[model samples]
Target chain A: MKLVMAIIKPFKLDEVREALTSLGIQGLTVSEVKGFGSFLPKVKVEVAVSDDQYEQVVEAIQKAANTGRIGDGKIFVLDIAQAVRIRTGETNTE
Target chain B: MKLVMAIIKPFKLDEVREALTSLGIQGLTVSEVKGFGSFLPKVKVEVAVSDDQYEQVVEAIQKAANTGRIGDGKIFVLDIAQAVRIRTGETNTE
Candidate 1:
């Protein structure tokens, strides 16, 4: 599985969430974060993504999260070996 | 290394942290966010993940965070191109 990480402008979050859900994505984790990119001033923000839907998830986020503006934030993908759902003991591909 | 991202119910943060730390994993970044999913209303939340413990971190998080509810949230893993500890400039796994 892959984990898709995104740092996006706060205002764009709602729109991004809607877009992802519409694509049949059931859930994603998100958090408020702060950082500065190459040419943008530091700002408060939100980051969200998921592992269950690793395939094509980044592309879904990019399409939804983009504002066609600088400081929209960055999207990154990483590899993962295994995952488990703690409450149900569900492991890998849950 | 890998990044394991999770979006979990807001109240489960403490348990999730304890579980991960108990597993000998240290250092994770978190932020507050909001999102929606099928049959679930929009909610305020947090996202946490690490780039170093890619193999089983997500499973650890799910085991700790879920409450047997519809919106227990989701987990994701991704490939990290590179990671550096800003405080130390330690690059490629600190």
Candidate 2:
């Protein structure tokens, strides 16, 4: 599986989440971060994640998190060895 | 090396840390974030990351940061070009 990371402006979060959920993605982990991207000055917002759903996740984020403007944040994808549901301790598919 | 990022509820931070620590992991950078997910309203919390412990780090987070609730946030892993310890200016995997 791959992990997708995005750095986005704060106000655009709601629309991003809505777009992702509608795509049938159920879980993701997000965090607030500060950084400077190509478009704007340094900014702050949460970063979201969906392990294994790399392609679909990125598509949703791109569709929802865009302002057609610069400094909209960035999304990244990387390889992952595994994921598990903490509560039930279920290992994700390899 | 990889960067593992998780966006979790504030309350879940400690448990997540404890789990990771117990797994023999150390040195994580965390930041507060605001986000939304499939099952809940928007929320505020922190995102944590371990520079290279891809497999074990995600496992620890998954084991520590679940509430069976929506909006629990998300975790992501990404390829990092480089990271440095600002205090010591240590770079390139020390």
Candidate 3:
């Protein structure tokens, strides 16, 4: 599985979540923070995507999150060796 | 090694940490977060686990975190290419 951590402006969660949910993404993990250098209230959306969902997910986030400004935030992608669902102990490696 | 992001109920953190600690896990990175739906005050615990400890760690988190209801939270795992301890510039990889 591929992991994507999108650091974005705080005001866009609704739009971003909508876009993600529209794409059949079930859930997301996020952190609320006052981020770097006067960019008050930056937030992070962390999601793990399978191979086919990568491009669409990133594009959806980029379109929904960009404000044409420097603080539009960044997205970091990484590999995930394994994934597990806590309540069910279901393995979701991709 | 793998990275596990556990999205759990806010008040469950202490118990979860203790469970992990008993298994020799240390140093978790967290951000005060308002999670999905009406789940407020959720804190995302970000920890990196070695291969040998993956299952046990997941079990510890689950046992300590489950509330047996909706919004009990979820866990997403991924492979980390490399990890660096910022203070000492020590690199950890799985």
Candidate 4:
């Protein structure tokens, strides 16, 4: 699995979430995150996905979060060594 | 090192924190996170740990967050190329 973390403008969260939903993503964690130094608040949406889902998911986020302006935010791709569904003791690996 | 990010029910925060503390984890970042559709509030706890600490850390989270039901949330292990203790300018590596 890959951990795809996106920093987006706060108001665009719903639009981005809706777009990701269309791609069949059921759950993502969103936190109100702030940047250092004279910056406004940003939304950090973190989605864990299968490696196969990485590209499309990133595209969906990029499209939905884009504003054709500055502070459109950034998309970070990280390697997720493991994942688990806490309720089921099920493990997901890449 | 790895970054273990856990999503747990809001009320379970203290349990999870205590579990982690007993394991010798000193610092962690917590944020308010939400899931998609018909879901309630949750807390996202992010702790960065050394490679040797991975398994036990996940166990600590799983044990503390589990409630034998749905919405027990998830734990994601991500590869962190580098991490810095911003306040002190110290670097941490895997």
lDDT of 4 by residue, A1-94 (tens): 8888999999999999889888888678777888766769999988888898898999999999999998898999888889988898679855
Q: Docking quality tier of candidate 1?
A: acceptable
DockQ result, candidate 4: 0.73
lDDT of 2: 0.60
How many clashes does the backbone of model 4 have? 1
TM-score winner between candidates 1 and 2: 2
DockQ of 2: 0.33
Point out the worst 10-residue segment of candidate 2 chain A by lDDT: A39-48
lDDT of each residue in B6-40, candidate 2, tens digit only: 65667888888788778776676665543444333
TM-score of each: 0.56, 0.58, 0.81, 0.87
Candidate 1 residue-wise lDDT, A37-83, digit = tens: 43433222233334556556677777777889867778776455554
lDDT of 1 by residue, B8-58 (tens): 666788887788778877666665555544232333322334555454666
Candidate 4, residues B9-33, lDDT tens digits: the string is 9889999999988999967899887
Clashing pairs in 3: A1-A94, A80-B78, A80-B79, A81-B78, A81-B79, B1-B94
Instruction: Enumerate the chain B TM-scores of all models.
Output: 0.72, 0.68, 0.85, 0.89
Whose TM-score is higher: candidate 1's or candidate 4's?
4
Question: For model 2, what is the alpha-carbon lDDT of residue A71?
Answer: 70
Q: List the global CA lDDT of all models.
A: 0.60, 0.60, 0.78, 0.87
Residue ranges of candidate 1 with Cα displaced over 4 Å? A37-55, B1-7, B14-31, B38-66, B74-94
Better of 3 and 4 by lDDT: 4
True contacts kept of each: 0.50, 0.35, 0.56, 0.80
Instruction: Identify the runs in model 2 with alpha carbons over 4 angstroms from their true place.
Output: A30-53, B1-9, B16-25, B38-94
Best by TM-score: 4
